[PDB]
Design a protein around this nucleic acid. Structure first.
Ligand SMILES: Nc1ccn([C@H]2C[C@H](O)[C@@H](COP(=O)(O)OP(=O)(O)OP(=O)(O)O)O2)c(=O)n1
Ligand SMILES: Nc1ccn([C@H]2C[C@H](O)[C@@H](COP(=O)(O)OP(=O)(O)OP(=O)(O)O)O2)c(=O)n1
Ligand SMILES: [Cl-]
Ligand SMILES: [Cl-]
Ligand SMILES: [Cl-]
Ligand SMILES: [Cl-]
Ligand SMILES: [Cl-]
Ligand SMILES: [Mn+2]
Ligand SMILES: [Mn+2]
Ligand SMILES: [Mn+2]
Ligand SMILES: [Mn+2]
Ligand SMILES: [Mn+2]
Ligand SMILES: [Mn+2]
Ligand code: NA
Ligand code: NA
Length: 326
DNA sequence: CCGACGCCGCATCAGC
DNA sequence: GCTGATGCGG
DNA sequence: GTCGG
């Protein structure tokens, strides 16, 4: 964390552009800068040194010189003082409340935790649970807990059908010592790109995990994606573990490698890797890598038998999960 | 200068 | 009910 | 906000 100050500043500026400005390319540009800088192995001494890094331009170079000189950025100190931006920024911390709803709420005079609690009736279901577990979701998860959760999820899934396979991805799979939540990839022989030979596949699982009281709430749910909440069982007399976010994603067993690549991330690594795909004339999603015809129209799925195969196509050497934390 | 900027599932709305 | 646009978070 | 072209 050589340049933690700079990257925090950029992160806050990113958050501002997303939540208040609703300027999603500014959001992403700052996030990119922040990530590149974050990986850089020297304590930055100037804007010009930063500006040697792809993603950092003049505007960010200026901001970094202002920061390294004073320890602050006047532009941030301002936004912090703006009640509206401050309120929009806070409200967006609730899962389900984006920039739009946030601006909505602040417009009706809803702009604090207390205001939200007294107005549950004005929140959709997702927003309701985000609020319910607000504090809980702020907490991080130590790996040792992720290892316990992993154990419960996996064995409960074997109890449903021995042919289910479940791979924990996200930061956990990247070897992080703490995760902000749990991401589960789920595959079953009876579900491939060529057929859905069984319905309920995901439901069957969410139910088992509900039966055993692991999963406690649901934010959203369709045939292949479940978004909700879970909680480790706590021993006799011990205070309960916090409530955690969980995501479960069912994908075609034959498309696992693109899936496992996708859900491992990081989000920024995926944006970076996919953009270099377009530059190299391919397109990648959670299901396939496919070539881009002269027109820009995608072609048929290329054969993939490994995470490595995917890197090959777009001429990148293989990067371990642990080295994908961007 | 210019246009592009990763790509997708589910919830909710508008319009028919 | 459907279908598409939009929000929201992955 | 940045960068390839
Ligand atoms: N949720 C999962 C997880 C794994 N597999 C599969 C496809 C693979 O070919 C294989 C791999 O076994 P591993 O558990 O060791 O997972 P890896 O993908 O890392 O191994 P490999 O790259 O050798 O396939 O089992 C699957 O179908 N669904
Ligand atoms: N804009 C995004 C956000 C997320 N993801 C992906 C890659 C991620 O790694 C995964 C999980 O999303 P998370 O928000 O859970 O991110 P992480 O697991 O990487 O981090 P955290 O430790 O906070 O959970 O899905 C993505 O493709 N694009
Ligand atoms: Cl923008
Ligand atoms: Cl500051
Ligand atoms: Cl796993
Ligand atoms: Cl596809
Ligand atoms: Cl690794
Ligand atoms: Mn995660
Ligand atoms: Mn998170
Ligand atoms: Mn997640
Ligand atoms: Mn709780
Ligand atoms: Mn571009
Ligand atoms: Mn240029
Ligand atoms: Na640069
Ligand atoms: Na939010």
């Amino acid at each position: 964390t050589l340049n933690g100050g700079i990257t925090d500043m950029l992160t806050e500026l990113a958050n501002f552009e997303k939540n208040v400005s609703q300027a999603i390319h500014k959001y992403n540009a700052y996030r990119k800068a922040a990530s590149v800088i974050a990986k850089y192995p020297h304590k930055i001494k100037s804007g010009a040194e930063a500006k040697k890094l792809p993603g950092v331009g003049t505007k960010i170079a200026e901001k970094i010189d202002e920061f390294l000189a004073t320890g602050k950025l006047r532009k941030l100190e301002k936004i912090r003082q703006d009640d509206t931006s401050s309120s929009i920024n806070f409200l967006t911390r609730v899962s389900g409340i984006g920039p739009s709803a946030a601006r909505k709420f602040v417009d009706e005079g809803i702009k604090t935790l207390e205001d939200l609690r007294k107005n549950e009736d004005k929140l959709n279901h997702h927003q309701r649970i985000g609020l319910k577990y607000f504090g809980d979701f702020e907490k991080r998860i130590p790996r040792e807990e992720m290892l316990q959760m992993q154990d419960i999820v996996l064995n409960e899934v074997k109890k449903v059908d021995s042919e289910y396979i479940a791979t924990v991805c996200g930061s956990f799979r990247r070897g992080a010592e703490s995760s902000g939540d749990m991401d589960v990839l789920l595959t079953h022989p009876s579900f491939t790109s060529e057929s859905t030979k069984q319905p309920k596949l995901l439901h069957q699982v969410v139910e088992q995990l509900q039966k055993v009281h692991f999963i406690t709430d649901t934010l959203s749910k369709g045939e292949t994606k479940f978004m909700g909440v879970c909680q480790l069982p706590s021993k006799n007399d011990e205070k309960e573990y916090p409530h955690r976010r969980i995501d479960i994603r069912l994908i075609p067993k034959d498309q696992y490698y693109c899936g496992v690549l996708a859900f491992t991330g990081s989000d920024i690594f995926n944006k970076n890797m996919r953009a270099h795909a377009l530059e190299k004339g391919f397109t990648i999603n959670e299901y396939t890598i496919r070539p881009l015809g002269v027109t820009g129209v995608a072609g048929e799925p290329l054969p993939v038998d490994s995470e490595k195969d995917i890197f090959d196509y777009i001429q990148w050497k293989y990067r371990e999960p642990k080295d994908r934390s961007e």
